Amino acid sequence: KNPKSDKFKVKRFHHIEFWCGDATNVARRFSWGLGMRFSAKSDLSTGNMVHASYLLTSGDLRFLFTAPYSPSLSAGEIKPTTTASIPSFDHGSCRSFFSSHGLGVRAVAIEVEDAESAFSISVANGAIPSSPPIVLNEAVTIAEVKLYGDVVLRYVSYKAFLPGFERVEDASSFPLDYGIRRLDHAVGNVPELGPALTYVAGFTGFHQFAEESGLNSAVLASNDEMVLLPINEPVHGTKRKSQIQTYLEHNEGAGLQHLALMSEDIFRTLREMRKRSSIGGFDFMPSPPPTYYQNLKKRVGDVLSDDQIKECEELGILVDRDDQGTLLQIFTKPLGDRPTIFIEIIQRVGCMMYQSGGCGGFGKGNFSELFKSIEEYEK
């Protein structure tokens, strides 16, 4: 059931912003590890005396990495005279965020028809304002409201990346590409799911998307179900400690848990990322036992050939299936020092009309399947 109750016009995911202590080193690591090109910058070289911001792109996926400079460089400025290209930036907020959470997502940005209205309607419907709407060079409007923890939902709208960002030199811009194409979903961890759901669905009008693991969760979705925002809470007293609870302890509270990036060819993406795991890229979760792949034929054998199923086994890919489509997925190890944020790589097969959002779900059944497999392997 989809009541299409969005209180304002939402388009797609626009970008994800990481708050860092050094944006250069994180962005270069992410670029090599994920195969994303350097596409725009705003920093001292572009006249920004406030923050350094570097944008990586792959397909429609946009990752932004921002860190503060010394406040001394901009001590003479006032908000009207700021050289910051993202006017919601604040030195103190950014330093406080990174010392509290470490490396993590500050902003989940969605493109909307009108960011001023989206902000107004949101706040009128209970959203906690974070940064009021501001118009950038009469071209782009940006506004922010609180989402969960210290994460904000950022609204972006264009009359016709951002003003004040320059295209970097293509000599500096090597055309890496491992097949990642867009952001599929962005997941939050909270201590209590009920209040978090009521709050976010309350101000967006997003609807609940049709669905012994250590969590309960629910998925909020926009009208066409292309903006997908799941939220998790821990379940306590399960002998095996909830991953959600471990997140909350190491992150100092609620925050973004994982980003799921859609690949146009998950096999090529994972070959390319795994080649780089030990030379600056990303590590992946432990592979499941071969039993899991020995039971895969009896479940998705009509969707994937036996060549592709053993190709899943080499790479550690998981497969799950809803009633409309099939989901191929895998998880990275945490992206930084803390066991908090990680990345999921996915590919969806089915639900063609274009592909409808959420085709195959989010891997729900792989919990019971992996537990059972573990037991079958030991035997």
Add this chain to the structure above:
Amino acid sequence: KNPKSDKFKVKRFHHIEFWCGDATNVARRFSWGLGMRFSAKSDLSTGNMVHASYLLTSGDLRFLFTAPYSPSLSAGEIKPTTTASIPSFDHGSCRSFFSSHGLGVRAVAIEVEDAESAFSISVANGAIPSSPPIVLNEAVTIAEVKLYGDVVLRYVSYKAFLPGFERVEDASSFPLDYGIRRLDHAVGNVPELGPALTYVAGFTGFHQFAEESGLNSAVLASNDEMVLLPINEPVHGTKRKSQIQTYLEHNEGAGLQHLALMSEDIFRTLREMRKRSSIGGFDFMPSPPPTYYQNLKKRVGDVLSDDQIKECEELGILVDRDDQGTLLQIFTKPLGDRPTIFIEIIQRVGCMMYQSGGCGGFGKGNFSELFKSIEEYEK
């Protein structure tokens, strides 16, 4: 003239410690960019609830990257009960360092015969204590005194990496190597060179090493001149703004300016690093005009073949010459967001007896040679 006045027995450079906000991402970037292997770790997986520390090695070069966890993880601990593997670590000092300076070197560590005596003699001769000597598992003693700004000189001594560090899994440890072999010199920037020299030479007994640019500098050296510690100060009012002054402004004061890493084959090192500049590695300074290489034959043509001189031209290598030997050198762009710390790659040819320290100097003459070349090119 070498009076050999060291007030305690110094051996070699032992390691350089970077204080980061996220040690994982900086260490992975540095590993790929410089060709350094992951060799030891101390973090949650080794029981360290205080800081995450990752060691990279290439030849005898040891780069350590450390970041704090949430203080909440170790709130029950006291210094006697700490799980930190580096007992001088302090959450507040580290957060204050990185928010003040950004990514940079916290510790220049030298191996000494006896770290407790080195600390005592140093302090008795004017050094400002930073962390008193502490014995680690009856095996290693470590002590720290202030060097300049928020950089410390760390003394390390072994009765027979550090206790509490584990060797990482060789699956995780890819044997990268681009030819870097050891730390040659570590350079500080201060506002006033005189007081900085008097202070450091005062407590070490290091002696001044035999020597319109925007700086004055001087080099302190241990008895055998293998530990080399140059220091720079700005010269003001030169039309072209002093790089030392730009450093001091963006770094919020004194600190480490550059690390010079010796390569056993600078041509292979720079080929390998330049291949990776645009895919997560390090960028290099702008190349000099071909005029500079057109004047190189008339200066070092007896040391390098005309094939090797044009090989310098491809790679942007600089060449300078003292009276004892020749110096091949090149500089990276700054390592992080701020125009502060950078790296120099070097190779020294001459002064064999082993190679004596400082053979060829530090590139003194390349200042006038590059200015003149610039003028000859324009013509």
